[PDB]
């Protein structure tokens, strides 16, 4: 089954207003990696730029103390608010949906691969309102995930940029 297909995308999703910088606040997921290495999370930043009906997305975060930039392309699936991170070899495709968001303070995104749903909360800046945090946890519960499957990411140590030697391009096939 596809849990993400039951998720309603942000009505009349406007990529123009969604563009810019987003700070990753938390992830709700049953992923084994997070359960075992979640307490090792790095401050993560997302930078979005509309590319037609698709969205170019760069993710910034440190690896071994060094700032990296990952370049991806959220492809247009034909449905407003729904995007596709195409599969690459044995790497399965990742479906994405921008659900709740006011474009100006927070965004709730869902990601799905192999039928497993993951939920992410982003914020334009910190601190995040109690209302948004509680709202996000409510969505995590509705996604059949427990409180022990919620991981809050660092609030400091973010990367503003990366040099040419630390840019991972996952756009060019």
């Amino acid at each position: 089954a596809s849990p993400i297909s039951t998720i309603q995308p942000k009505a009349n999703f406007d990529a123009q207003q969604f563009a810019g910088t987003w700070l990753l606040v938390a992830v709700g997921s049953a992923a084994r990696f997070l359960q075992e290495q979640g307490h090792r999370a790095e401050a993560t930043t997302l930078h979005v730029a509309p590319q037609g009906t698709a969205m170019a997305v760069s993710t910034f975060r440190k690896l071994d103390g060094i700032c990296w930039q990952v370049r991806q392309l959220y492809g247009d699936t034909g449905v407003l608010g729904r995007f596709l991170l195409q599969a690459r070899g044995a790497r399965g495709a990742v479906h994405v949906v921008v659900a709740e968001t006011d474009y100006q303070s927070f965004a709730v995104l869902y990601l799905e691969r192999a039928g497993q749903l993951s939920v992410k909360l982003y914020a334009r800046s910190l601190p995040v309102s109690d209302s948004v945090l509680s709202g996000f946890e409510q969505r995590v519960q509705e996604a059949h995930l427990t409180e022990d499957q919620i991981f809050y990411f660092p609030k400091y140590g973010f990367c503003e940029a990366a040099d040419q030697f630390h840019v991972l391009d996952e756009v060019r096939r």
Binding site: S29, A31, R61, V94, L111, S118, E170
Partner: peptide
């Protein structure tokens, strides 16, 4: 190097 966005994993 690869990035799994579902688990915020860089490996």
């Amino acid at each position: 190097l690869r990035y799994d966005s579902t688990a915020e994993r860089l490996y």
